[PDB]
Amino acid sequence: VVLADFWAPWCGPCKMIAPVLEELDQEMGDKLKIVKIDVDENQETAGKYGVMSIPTLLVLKDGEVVETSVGFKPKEALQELVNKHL
Amino acid sequence: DFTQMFYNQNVKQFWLPEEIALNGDLLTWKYLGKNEQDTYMKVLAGLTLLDTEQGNTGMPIVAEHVDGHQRKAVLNFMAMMENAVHAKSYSNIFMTLAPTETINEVFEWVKQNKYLQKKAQMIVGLYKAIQKDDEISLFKAMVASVYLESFLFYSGFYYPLYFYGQGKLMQSGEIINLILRDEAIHGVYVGLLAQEIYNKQTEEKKAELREFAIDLLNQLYENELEYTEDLYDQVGLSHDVKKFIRYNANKALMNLGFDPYFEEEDINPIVLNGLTVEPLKDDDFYF
Amino acid sequence: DFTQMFYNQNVKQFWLPEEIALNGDLLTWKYLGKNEQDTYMKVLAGLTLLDTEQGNTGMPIVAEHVDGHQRKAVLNFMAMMENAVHAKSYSNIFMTLAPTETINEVFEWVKQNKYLQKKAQMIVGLYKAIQKDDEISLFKAMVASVYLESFLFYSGFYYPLYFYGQGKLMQSGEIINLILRDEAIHGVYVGLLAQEIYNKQTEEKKAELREFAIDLLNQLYENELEYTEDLYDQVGLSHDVKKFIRYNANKALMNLGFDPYFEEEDINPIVLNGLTVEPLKDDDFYF
Amino acid sequence: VPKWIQLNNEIMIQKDGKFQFDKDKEAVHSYFVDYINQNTVFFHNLKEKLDYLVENQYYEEEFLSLYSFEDIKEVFKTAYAKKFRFPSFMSAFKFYNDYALKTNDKKKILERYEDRISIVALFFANGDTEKAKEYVNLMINQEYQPSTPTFLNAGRKRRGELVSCFLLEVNDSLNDISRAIDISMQLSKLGGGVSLNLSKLRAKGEAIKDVENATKGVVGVMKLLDNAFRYADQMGQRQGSGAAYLNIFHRDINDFLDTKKISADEDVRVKTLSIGVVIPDKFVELAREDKAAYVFYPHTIYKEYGQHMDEMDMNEMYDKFVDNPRVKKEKINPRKLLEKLAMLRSESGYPYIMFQDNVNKVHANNHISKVKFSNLCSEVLQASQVSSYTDYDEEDEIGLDISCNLGSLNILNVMEHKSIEKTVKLATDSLTHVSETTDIRNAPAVRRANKAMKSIGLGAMNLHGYLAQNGIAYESPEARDFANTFFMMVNFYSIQRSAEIAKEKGETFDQYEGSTYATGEYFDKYVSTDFSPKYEKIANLFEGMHIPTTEDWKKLKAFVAEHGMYHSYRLCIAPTGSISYVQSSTASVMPIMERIEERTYGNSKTYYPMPGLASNNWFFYKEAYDMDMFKVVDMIATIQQHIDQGISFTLFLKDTMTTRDLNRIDLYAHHRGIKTIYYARTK
Amino acid sequence: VPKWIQLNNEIMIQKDGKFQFDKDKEAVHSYFVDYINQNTVFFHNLKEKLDYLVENQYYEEEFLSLYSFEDIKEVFKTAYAKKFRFPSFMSAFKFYNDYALKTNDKKKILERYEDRISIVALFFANGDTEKAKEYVNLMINQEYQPSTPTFLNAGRKRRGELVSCFLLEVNDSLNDISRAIDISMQLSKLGGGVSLNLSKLRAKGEAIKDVENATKGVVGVMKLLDNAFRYADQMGQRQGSGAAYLNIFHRDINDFLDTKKISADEDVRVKTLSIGVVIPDKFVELAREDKAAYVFYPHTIYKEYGQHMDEMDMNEMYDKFVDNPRVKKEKINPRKLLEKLAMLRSESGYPYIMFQDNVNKVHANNHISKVKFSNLCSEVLQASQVSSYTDYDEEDEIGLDISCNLGSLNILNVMEHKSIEKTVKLATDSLTHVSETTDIRNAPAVRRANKAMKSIGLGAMNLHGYLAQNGIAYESPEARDFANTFFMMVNFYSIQRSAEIAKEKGETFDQYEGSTYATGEYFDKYVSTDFSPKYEKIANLFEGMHIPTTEDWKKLKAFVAEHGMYHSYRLCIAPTGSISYVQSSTASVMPIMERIEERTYGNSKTYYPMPGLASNNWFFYKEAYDMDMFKVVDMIATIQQHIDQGISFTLFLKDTMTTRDLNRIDLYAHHRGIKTIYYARTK
Ligand SMILES: [Mg+2]
Ligand SMILES: [Mg+2]
Ligand SMILES: [Mn+2]
Ligand SMILES: [Mn+2]
Ligand SMILES: [Mn+2]
Ligand SMILES: [Mn+2]
């Protein structure tokens, strides 16, 4: 189970989600991998996943996208989103 | 963001009835037909009766329930204009054009008139329904107030503006134009106070308030069409008056931050004729 | 027999603080001691509070309960003057003479000052106790209003008048004289309405109403003494101001149709020095 | 306060119930002694002064080179031999503040009155010593006053033009409109006011090359002209003043008038552009019968008939336009338009009203062109031909554009000296010299018409002053009789001098043979009616002067037929404004607005009683607003019948008189033969 | 709601979390089938259509007469042989609403896309059937897009001019100012945007012929030109857009900038005059060193040196001006002025920042004149000479006023066809034809410069669209490498075609021998530096195309030296904001503002997804506001080194960034060699 964060350095909401993902890694990092990808440097992956703003959070399970969340989310909402797929 | 600006615009528009001499209107009044004189009298009485409700209830009730010293002051100023300036101005126009007995009869007729009463009582009903510390009921009353200021008056204003645009009854037309200019700013101001309440609501509550506003507009509009035919068919103007009502309904909606309801139409041209610095700190010239 | 002449007098007295340029007081203000400036700011702040409540509450509520469109027009106009003109003028004075922090501090000071809160509590309480169709509750509020207009303002008015009379702060003083000129006619008018209600009563009821008026005056008076000492001891004028407020208490009683209550005293003479479109026809084309 | 100003303020300080009018002479004496004599540059001799003024680029050298220094010195001695003294402080103040030459730093004064007059006379004479002395006698006696441009700029290097007016015909093309803007600016930088005829411009909603509803009307051209005159503001010392004239049958007439409304928005309003309305007799007829009128689109008429709307007689072609389906128009109410004119004049004094048929009924040069528009002062009425300004590197068709060569007779000083003939002839010669020496290179039509028509304007002033100082009320029939006789004499001697100049030069004005002067139609009322005074009191005023008779007019008509006439136009009565103070005269032939003028200068309040005002003639100097406007119309029409051009006729209205009263005055002026109405001054 | 608009409204209705981009093809199909085919008038044969259009004043009969009817028929057939299908609804809507010929009542469609293209091709070829078919293939493949005036008005009778922009030099005189107003109105009547250089106009408070402090500065001229453009606003089809350019060292620079302030009063505020500021490197040097700078009075410099201030080198003459007591000047703070510029661009988008030394350091025609100002779109950087318009009847000294004939390459379509050389050469030939057939009789300097300079503008567009559709980020170094290579090839083939035209016609542009093309200085960086792609991904894009190497550039330099150059200027990248929709291309070389543009035409919103926008390339179509402006400056400077004229560089800023960020972007653009900056768009 992987939480992929599509972000950019200029994106205000993406700066707000960064500390939330660090807390989530401390609490769940034994069962959840967190991956960050910068869409300004990695346009091909952002295009492949048809991701249409930032932050976009993809929950992947064994390489397949099982859930998609757009915009800022608090920690508890990200935990609920990931715990469905653990 | 807006009350001090409206304060300024309101007080700089201050005027008094005595400033316009009315007697010279008798030189065009005498040349109108009976139907024209009848329609004018009835329209004038309609405006007078509605404006009295606004002076005695509409503005003072809103001033009472709105919080903020500066808003209460602006609202007080508007209430003053209704009672001290507008009401005296309408009376002056009447006393100039008709003898005492004719004035009393016209007011008796318009007081019993079904279409005038329907709209007058609908508006007054919403003012009477405001409850202390309930912003929803206040908003509904503000909508009613904006509809009166920016919409309901205009089936009436049409006729004086129509004459004014033709060079007839110029003194009373000048007075009406000053009154109308006050009601326009009153409508815009109360509209901003209503939007403030609207913007504090949830999305479901907003949709519900929009439905209220549109439903109310529809009821008033259908009665305006009947009111219009009742007064203006005898002088052949109803088609053009209806266009003017819809155009002003759209302005009232825009005052409440809502989209126009009616398609854009052209208006009678005679009535139209009547109407972050950040200083360069060096090291920015080097890259 | 009187409303029309009061209507005409009120509207002919209409003014705005912006008509008076205030930058001329800048130097005589700069030259006052810290004690004098403090008392002056606080005095005007106390006045601002009184006018805020007279405009927001007192005049509109009395207007609501008094019958007759012309009487209501006068009372509505007076209400507008209170909050749209008088209360605002004090801010014009403050914004000219004082830095923002001193302005912020004095408005915080009104909120926590016990005498100013007590007098507001008492006056506004009576306004809010008015019951529809109950003339006695209305009379009591009108007595309170006369006491505000003709008595309570005067502990405040003393100081601007005291300076005006010495040729100091004369632009601010001009504003204050205009405010005072308004309050004098407001106190007379409300006094006449109160007398109307009083004159309807039995002798027994009248005796009770006089008791109410005198008890209320004494209660307000005792509070005003403490307020006066609190403000004026630091400028050495408390005894002089006390004589002035007693003088004006008698004027308030007289406005209510009652005999003077305090004995006559010599007031500071400085303060006394501080006081057409005619259309063409067919016959104009032949000569 | 200064001593002279303080003494002037004692005029209104009343002692024994009478104004201290004698204090004014003390004011002149104090003003001179304390300010002028101290701050005038004095030279050891006239030679040093002339050398200083020419060398420092204050005077032109060409006009002084035509005289030996002995002749110039004799001329200056003749000017100073009179020992002219200003009789009112305001006269000297006006001259030494506006017209006296000052140093480049404005600290000192270089020219006295006798110096400016001498220089103007030397300019006028053009090498003739006797003629220069005659001009000096004419001006130092204050019999004749050259116009403000001519008096100010004659013989000075730092100047503009001596021409007061410029009347431009604007054709219906973008090239012609651009050239109109260019010429308007080039003539405003010269100082003279510019008036433009916009009746040829097609209305709003007309087609530009077969695409419909393309034009924005004459209002856009008025915007362009207004900003052009604002740009050419002559340093801002005198703001750029321009006029725009439109025929009342032009479609844009309502929008033309809408720009002078106070309620008009800034998107339509013009500020520096005065407006005038040309009213043919057809509009007055339509208003009289209360029948619906039509305003026509000029370009549709031009397409249908091949001629401009204002080149066709509307009294004849109005019906043809109305029953023409290819001519576009909209129904209007002529009486409503008249009421709109009256209320616009009440509110702002605009527009100038030009009765076209009144002008063209007695216009001598209708063969050249009918008078389609007037000047900025609404007193010049001359034939004009439009200029077809073509695209670049294409030859332009140059027409005729009118110019003011103005000069005023002081009726008081003219009749005191009993020299109507001599003054009129010398003034005509001076105006002829001004017209000849004018060469404006950036206005082709103006230059061509100045060379061809040779038109001059000889006005008169101090009519009310002369009448009141002779115990004659302005509205009295004796005043009208005097005006009739005086202006018939002026017309007689102006025609005589024009014919004499034509004989002496061997040339007339261009297209003279078609004028009524050549055919003798002009002299019909002069050889059929006797204009000698009908009052014994008035006849005594002309005693010692040969009043021309019917036989004298017949001899003059024969002389004109044999020898021709040099000037197409000779007489036009300008408003005669700030220069009327210097001459100690009432402005124009208008009645005086106020008996004592209250003027503000700096921090001082200055008072100017009208000349000759005293206790005996206090009620003869009746204020213009107190007069009956109908009798003033009668007076002007009596004067107008002897003036070939128009008269700057200002209406003086009380506050109580409505728009119907103003319309009655306008219609009585039209009925009495008044050509133009200048201003509606409401008190 | 129309069916096509409702289908286009389905783009943003996301199904499965994806945009329905396939609905746009359905939208265009519905648009055609239900509106265009129904409202297109059809003729039995092409002969009937051509006869009807020629006889009804829709087409010029002259340009169709050089071809036999079989040739025109075959040109149309090869236009329809492509069977061109619009890829988006907005393309067809924009074409059939703005450019497609409609009847006089604007009710039926007379021209298809393939008919507009055929007519424009027949106009371009001028009697050559094979060349006409080549142009048809060029435009129907959408490799080259003629400018909006050219595409809309080629072969039409109801046409203005084919020139998109005009640049006028205004001299310091009233004659020159009036003629500049006239020419501005004439060229706005023709439909083209007019840019005026006000740096030669003398400052406010200057002397007019010994009359000191009389000028109104350049701001009065701005008011005049603003009202001229309002008056000549193409009757309301599109408001008259004009441009005023002033040097930053002009004294009126603050007054010039204050015209765009919101707080500015209506007496100093212009509304239709776009303002541009010319910044020499000296101003940037003074601002960098924080020394107090001086803005100068141009007339004092003209009197002292005999040349206008903008005609001299500021970097060399600044110290001489400052040390000259006879040159009047006022002290300013260059850093405060830069901050004022930044705040003005933030609040209104004005002025157009032009770096004069960035233009003239690589300007090939500095011998003719330095580039003192740009056009209304800040992309036409050409040498111009001021015209000395003299008085009437006096011959004017006609100079050179820039006329720019624009044309755009669709980078996506040019690259997909592997036809850089043929497209560039055919576009150069078409622009040469447009320049030759264009004559303007009312602008002598524009006509003279069109005949002599023969300057054309060959722009480019769909840079960001091509990069995103190829998986290249606009800010990536690969994108800059592609821009470098593509525009080097474009410059190579434009120079080659210009030299071939000069050889075929035997004539070069006037004063070619003094240009860097003749001396070989232009080709130094091309014969020294190799501009082949440095990235294998970019080099694969140019597969099948011969990239000009160093040896090829040496051969081209020798060819130019031997035969000359027909065009003084060839490449200029215009914004092309209107024709971009029709060609399904991103506007100019600018990055896209929005991925899906929201447009309201009537009471219905019409969404326009970016050309080729999809799910796989969503993040490659990065919005310009989210991009680093330094990277965009780097891209434009990479492009600018291969463009002899300027590029319409628009700055896309966020509301979070301050005026210091705007100044930093401006200074980075100046440092990177950016010639002009068009707009500062804030989101
Ligand atoms: Mg033409
Ligand atoms: Mg010059
Ligand atoms: Mn009202
Ligand atoms: Mn109202
Ligand atoms: Mn008060
Ligand atoms: Mn009060």
Side-chain angles (χ1 to χ4, degrees), chain E residues 379-399:
Chain E
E379 32 90 15
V380 178
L381 301 173
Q382 306 189 14
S384 47
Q385 296 176 353
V386 77
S387 310
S388 178
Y389 296 105
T390 61
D391 297 337
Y392 201 95
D393 276 292
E394 229 169 61
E395 309 300 312
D396 318 326
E397 294 77 50
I398 298 312

mmCIF file of all heavy atoms in Angstrom, chain E residues 379-399:
data_model
loop_
_atom_site.group_PDB
_atom_site.id
_atom_site.type_symbol
_atom_site.label_atom_id
_atom_site.label_comp_id
_atom_site.label_asym_id
_atom_site.label_seq_id
_atom_site.Cartn_x
_atom_site.Cartn_y
_atom_site.Cartn_z
ATOM 1 N N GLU E 379 6.357 44.190 -30.425
ATOM 2 C CA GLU E 379 7.129 43.170 -31.122
ATOM 3 C C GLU E 379 7.746 43.646 -32.427
ATOM 4 O O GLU E 379 8.539 42.902 -33.014
ATOM 5 C CB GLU E 379 6.261 41.933 -31.407
ATOM 6 C CG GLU E 379 4.794 42.232 -31.650
ATOM 7 C CD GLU E 379 4.482 42.478 -33.107
ATOM 8 O OE1 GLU E 379 5.331 42.147 -33.959
ATOM 9 O OE2 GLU E 379 3.387 43.001 -33.404
ATOM 10 N N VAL E 380 7.420 44.844 -32.898
ATOM 11 C CA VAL E 380 7.947 45.373 -34.149
ATOM 12 C C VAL E 380 9.055 46.356 -33.804
ATOM 13 O O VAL E 380 8.791 47.511 -33.456
ATOM 14 C CB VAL E 380 6.850 46.037 -34.990
ATOM 15 C CG1 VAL E 380 7.441 46.617 -36.257
ATOM 16 C CG2 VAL E 380 5.764 45.034 -35.320
ATOM 17 N N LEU E 381 10.299 45.899 -33.900
ATOM 18 C CA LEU E 381 11.477 46.693 -33.564
ATOM 19 C C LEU E 381 12.248 46.962 -34.849
ATOM 20 O O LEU E 381 13.083 46.156 -35.269
ATOM 21 C CB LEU E 381 12.326 45.979 -32.531
ATOM 22 C CG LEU E 381 11.571 45.701 -31.235
ATOM 23 C CD1 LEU E 381 12.403 44.858 -30.316
ATOM 24 C CD2 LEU E 381 11.207 47.008 -30.563
ATOM 25 N N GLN E 382 11.966 48.103 -35.471
ATOM 26 C CA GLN E 382 12.548 48.463 -36.752
ATOM 27 C C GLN E 382 13.097 49.880 -36.702
ATOM 28 O O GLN E 382 12.659 50.705 -35.896
ATOM 29 C CB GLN E 382 11.518 48.351 -37.878
ATOM 30 C CG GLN E 382 10.845 46.999 -37.955
ATOM 31 C CD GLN E 382 10.008 46.844 -39.198
ATOM 32 O OE1 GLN E 382 10.125 47.628 -40.137
ATOM 33 N NE2 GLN E 382 9.157 45.827 -39.216
ATOM 34 N N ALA E 383 14.069 50.147 -37.567
ATOM 35 C CA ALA E 383 14.606 51.493 -37.697
ATOM 36 C C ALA E 383 13.565 52.415 -38.315
ATOM 37 O O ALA E 383 12.865 52.044 -39.262
ATOM 38 C CB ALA E 383 15.870 51.483 -38.552
ATOM 39 N N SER E 384 13.463 53.625 -37.772
ATOM 40 C CA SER E 384 12.514 54.609 -38.266
ATOM 41 C C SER E 384 13.164 55.983 -38.261
ATOM 42 O O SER E 384 14.003 56.288 -37.411
ATOM 43 C CB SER E 384 11.233 54.632 -37.424
ATOM 44 O OG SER E 384 11.534 54.657 -36.040
ATOM 45 N N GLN E 385 12.759 56.809 -39.218
ATOM 46 C CA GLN E 385 13.225 58.182 -39.330
ATOM 47 C C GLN E 385 12.031 59.116 -39.225
ATOM 48 O O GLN E 385 10.978 58.861 -39.816
ATOM 49 C CB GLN E 385 13.966 58.410 -40.649
ATOM 50 C CG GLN E 385 15.244 57.602 -40.784
ATOM 51 C CD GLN E 385 15.905 57.780 -42.136
ATOM 52 O OE1 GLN E 385 15.346 58.405 -43.035
ATOM 53 N NE2 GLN E 385 17.104 57.229 -42.285
ATOM 54 N N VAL E 386 12.194 60.194 -38.471
ATOM 55 C CA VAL E 386 11.095 61.121 -38.235
ATOM 56 C C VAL E 386 10.873 61.968 -39.480
ATOM 57 O O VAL E 386 11.817 62.299 -40.211
ATOM 58 C CB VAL E 386 11.370 61.986 -36.991
ATOM 59 C CG1 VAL E 386 12.366 63.096 -37.298
ATOM 60 C CG2 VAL E 386 10.071 62.553 -36.446
ATOM 61 N N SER E 387 9.613 62.297 -39.744
ATOM 62 C CA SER E 387 9.236 63.104 -40.894
ATOM 63 C C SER E 387 9.021 64.543 -40.452
ATOM 64 O O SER E 387 8.266 64.801 -39.509
ATOM 65 C CB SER E 387 7.970 62.558 -41.553
ATOM 66 O OG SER E 387 8.085 61.168 -41.796
ATOM 67 N N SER E 388 9.683 65.474 -41.135
ATOM 68 C CA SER E 388 9.557 66.897 -40.830
ATOM 69 C C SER E 388 8.453 67.468 -41.709
ATOM 70 O O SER E 388 8.689 67.920 -42.829
ATOM 71 C CB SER E 388 10.882 67.616 -41.044
ATOM 72 O OG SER E 388 10.757 69.003 -40.794
ATOM 73 N N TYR E 389 7.228 67.441 -41.194
ATOM 74 C CA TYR E 389 6.084 67.982 -41.914
ATOM 75 C C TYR E 389 6.082 69.499 -41.778
ATOM 76 O O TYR E 389 5.946 70.029 -40.671
ATOM 77 C CB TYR E 389 4.785 67.383 -41.381
ATOM 78 C CG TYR E 389 4.677 65.892 -41.601
ATOM 79 C CD1 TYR E 389 4.859 65.001 -40.553
ATOM 80 C CD2 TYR E 389 4.405 65.377 -42.859
ATOM 81 C CE1 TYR E 389 4.763 63.638 -40.752
ATOM 82 C CE2 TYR E 389 4.306 64.015 -43.069
ATOM 83 C CZ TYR E 389 4.488 63.150 -42.011
ATOM 84 O OH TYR E 389 4.391 61.793 -42.216
ATOM 85 N N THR E 390 6.235 70.193 -42.900
ATOM 86 C CA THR E 390 6.361 71.641 -42.903
ATOM 87 C C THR E 390 4.988 72.283 -43.082
ATOM 88 O O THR E 390 3.951 71.614 -43.040
ATOM 89 C CB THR E 390 7.341 72.077 -43.990
ATOM 90 O OG1 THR E 390 6.849 71.661 -45.270
ATOM 91 C CG2 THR E 390 8.706 71.453 -43.755
ATOM 92 N N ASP E 391 4.970 73.597 -43.284
ATOM 93 C CA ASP E 391 3.725 74.325 -43.462
ATOM 94 C C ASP E 391 3.062 73.934 -44.782
ATOM 95 O O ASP E 391 3.643 73.245 -45.625
ATOM 96 C CB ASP E 391 3.975 75.830 -43.423
ATOM 97 C CG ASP E 391 4.506 76.300 -42.084
ATOM 98 O OD1 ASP E 391 4.286 75.598 -41.075
ATOM 99 O OD2 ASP E 391 5.142 77.374 -42.037
ATOM 100 N N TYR E 392 1.819 74.379 -44.949
ATOM 101 C CA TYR E 392 1.115 74.150 -46.202
ATOM 102 C C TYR E 392 1.820 74.876 -47.342
ATOM 103 O O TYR E 392 2.424 75.936 -47.154
ATOM 104 C CB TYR E 392 -0.337 74.616 -46.088
ATOM 105 C CG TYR E 392 -1.266 73.991 -47.103
ATOM 106 C CD1 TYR E 392 -2.010 72.862 -46.789
ATOM 107 C CD2 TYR E 392 -1.396 74.527 -48.376
ATOM 108 C CE1 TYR E 392 -2.860 72.288 -47.712
ATOM 109 C CE2 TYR E 392 -2.241 73.959 -49.307
ATOM 110 C CZ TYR E 392 -2.972 72.841 -48.970
ATOM 111 O OH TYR E 392 -3.815 72.273 -49.894
ATOM 112 N N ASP E 393 1.753 74.278 -48.532
ATOM 113 C CA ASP E 393 2.458 74.722 -49.732
ATOM 114 C C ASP E 393 3.971 74.649 -49.580
ATOM 115 O O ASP E 393 4.704 75.181 -50.424
ATOM 116 C CB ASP E 393 2.042 76.142 -50.146
ATOM 117 C CG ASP E 393 0.777 76.158 -50.982
ATOM 118 O OD1 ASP E 393 0.818 75.668 -52.131
ATOM 119 O OD2 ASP E 393 -0.256 76.660 -50.492
ATOM 120 N N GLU E 394 4.459 74.004 -48.525
ATOM 121 C CA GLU E 394 5.879 73.770 -48.313
ATOM 122 C C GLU E 394 6.132 72.271 -48.333
ATOM 123 O O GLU E 394 5.414 71.509 -47.677
ATOM 124 C CB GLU E 394 6.342 74.372 -46.984
ATOM 125 C CG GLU E 394 7.593 75.227 -47.086
ATOM 126 C CD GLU E 394 7.869 76.002 -45.815
ATOM 127 O OE1 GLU E 394 8.080 75.364 -44.762
ATOM 128 O OE2 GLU E 394 7.874 77.250 -45.867
ATOM 129 N N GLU E 395 7.140 71.849 -49.094
ATOM 130 C CA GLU E 395 7.430 70.429 -49.232
ATOM 131 C C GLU E 395 7.859 69.839 -47.894
ATOM 132 O O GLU E 395 8.707 70.405 -47.197
ATOM 133 C CB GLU E 395 8.516 70.209 -50.283
ATOM 134 C CG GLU E 395 8.246 70.906 -51.605
ATOM 135 C CD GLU E 395 6.958 70.446 -52.255
ATOM 136 O OE1 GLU E 395 6.743 69.219 -52.348
ATOM 137 O OE2 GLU E 395 6.159 71.311 -52.673
ATOM 138 N N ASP E 396 7.268 68.703 -47.537
ATOM 139 C CA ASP E 396 7.588 68.023 -46.291
ATOM 140 C C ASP E 396 8.773 67.090 -46.484
ATOM 141 O O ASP E 396 8.930 66.473 -47.541
ATOM 142 C CB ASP E 396 6.382 67.235 -45.778
ATOM 143 C CG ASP E 396 5.081 67.996 -45.921
ATOM 144 O OD1 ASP E 396 5.100 69.238 -45.786
ATOM 145 O OD2 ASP E 396 4.039 67.355 -46.163
ATOM 146 N N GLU E 397 9.609 66.993 -45.453
ATOM 147 C CA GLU E 397 10.731 66.057 -45.442
ATOM 148 C C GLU E 397 10.213 64.727 -44.916
ATOM 149 O O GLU E 397 10.130 64.511 -43.704
ATOM 150 C CB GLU E 397 11.880 66.592 -44.595
ATOM 151 C CG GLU E 397 12.544 67.847 -45.151
ATOM 152 C CD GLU E 397 11.733 69.105 -44.903
ATOM 153 O OE1 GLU E 397 11.313 69.326 -43.749
ATOM 154 O OE2 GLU E 397 11.516 69.872 -45.864
ATOM 155 N N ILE E 398 9.859 63.831 -45.830
ATOM 156 C CA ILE E 398 9.233 62.565 -45.462
ATOM 157 C C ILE E 398 10.307 61.589 -45.001
ATOM 158 O O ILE E 398 11.298 61.357 -45.703
ATOM 159 C CB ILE E 398 8.431 61.994 -46.641
ATOM 160 C CG1 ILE E 398 7.298 62.947 -47.029
ATOM 161 C CG2 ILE E 398 7.880 60.626 -46.296
ATOM 162 C CD1 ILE E 398 6.480 63.436 -45.857
ATOM 163 N N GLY E 399 10.112 61.019 -43.821
ATOM 164 C CA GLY E 399 10.995 60.022 -43.258
ATOM 165 C C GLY E 399 10.457 58.618 -43.434
ATOM 166 O O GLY E 399 9.682 58.333 -44.354
#
